Amino acid sequence: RPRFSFSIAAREGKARTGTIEMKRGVIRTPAFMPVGTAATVKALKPETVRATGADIILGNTYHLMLRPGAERIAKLGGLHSFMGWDRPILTDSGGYQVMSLSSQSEEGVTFKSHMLSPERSIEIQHLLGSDIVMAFDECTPYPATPSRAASSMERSMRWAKRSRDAFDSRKEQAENAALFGIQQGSVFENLRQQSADALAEIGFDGYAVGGLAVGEGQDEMFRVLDFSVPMLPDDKPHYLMGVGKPDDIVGAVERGIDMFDCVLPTRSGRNGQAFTWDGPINIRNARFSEDLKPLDSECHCAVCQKWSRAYIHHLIRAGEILGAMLMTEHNIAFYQQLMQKIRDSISEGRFSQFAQDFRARYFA
Template identity: 60%
Template sequence: LTDSGGFQVMSLAGLRKLTEDGVTFKSHIDGSKHALSPERSMEIQRLLGSDIVMCFDECPALPADRKRIEESMRLSMRWAQRSRDAFGDRPGHMLFGIQQGGLEQDLRAESAEALTAIGFDGYAIGGLAVGEGQEAMFGCLDFAPDQLPEDRPRYLMGVGKPDDIVGAVKRGIDMMDCVLPSRSGRTGQAWTRRGQVNLKNARHADDPRPLDEDCTCPACRNYSRAYLHHVQRAGEMIAGMLLTWHNLHYYQELMGEMRDAIAAGAFDAFEARFHADRAAGDIDRL
């Protein structure tokens, strides 16, 4: 799965010019200009060999005024049609449309209607996790997924922390993506059933116990907290490698547990246990 460049349209706002045709970026290195349009985005993702392609969109960072959100959403819908036309007929590959509209229920509904009329293989909910906070995000997810077709995957972009993921799945989300497992691993942060653990903290310096005694990843099976603390503080590359390995393992287990709970009709029990484990906090200091 590849993104279209739409996030960079937002995050590099100070280095780009936005028009109906697309976006022109100015390189922060040498000042050269680079154009990206719906058609060019489809071409790049095809050349990358993507299985799941995202249509090219634009969204403002939140908070933003309603007029700005409305104009952005309608531009994204016009770009969605152009993306669909440029994508063409590619058996074995999928194109997802991206719902926009900020936190506004009526604008989200308008966006969902436009995307459904165009027709996509799956539907993403974009424009969240861009500064609005968890409460506002969940408020939007209380209605946004239900506006999209039930017989297609519903994908929340850019999320996120484990409690964000559980809350999103509870509200009808099927897919998510985030850099957090690897970014956290590189900075000494580990995600466990009992919450986040900062391996930089001195409390781990002489702790022979594993990061998580119930985890079967190589970092937990073969290394102690003391070792992980040491290589993190020493700046050794293996620190980020092992913690990223652990974080990815934890995230995969979390997703698997949710799939099993949904299949068994026991998601509420899973959610209660998930929050109880996190509330217990990390293991006591030696």
């Protein structure tokens, strides 16, 4: 098994489908990564995550370095052994949560729930045993000004080189893991270009598009993807961080994105929102109290084979943990079925038709 091999099997327009082969397994692209912030995909055993079709999950450097601790996880055998997921794990670098959750120099950032630098982030991700390591970046809030966008971007590019060097200095990491760079530059075409050029000069295994899904709206996000994804190396995976709703994912694939992560299916499942091919529904609504149909009429997941809307409605209204478990399994399974339909339609040269058919029914 190779360290990291991305192969594009089929294209349609800007959309691609294929595989990333890694030592712990194969990732089918376009891929959706369930988020496992605190070494768990919330309310699911790892076997259940796998059963839904997930090939890879996401963990977070910031959360795990605080609880339970990166050195502690390494002493316990690594994140895979710790949480019981033996397939690839991508770890975000911590740059976003340092900004978004905690309370800043060229060397790095100090904060209160600790210090984080490019070199420390890579070391933490090494200690976790991450398969796809993200470069450590400096994030700026939305809506950023041109000055704050450029200044965050250029520092992020200097930090990308430092991340690259720290990764390459760790023999075990360099031989067994992969490293992705993060393109910044907010909604400004020029800065996105300067960012892409700098990352391509350094050379990474994959290229993430950062700085989106922070409140910009789908139109603007698509506008930025329109010019930003062509700037990235075509022969490497393209990862859109933090995205997103099902229609966001379809449109991002139409624009060249290969990888996705977001908390929406897990978080909104626990809140009562279930995704269906006819759009989301809120299972708490009184109209479901005696609905014997499954959450979705076509879904193949174990929840839709076994339980009714009426039962899940009862569980969520009662605050029952099984409600959260079932909603989450169905939502993650729905997302994986979406990615499967995207992959098959690109492979078959009918993704354009699938996207139109998906949107017409989903927004009917």
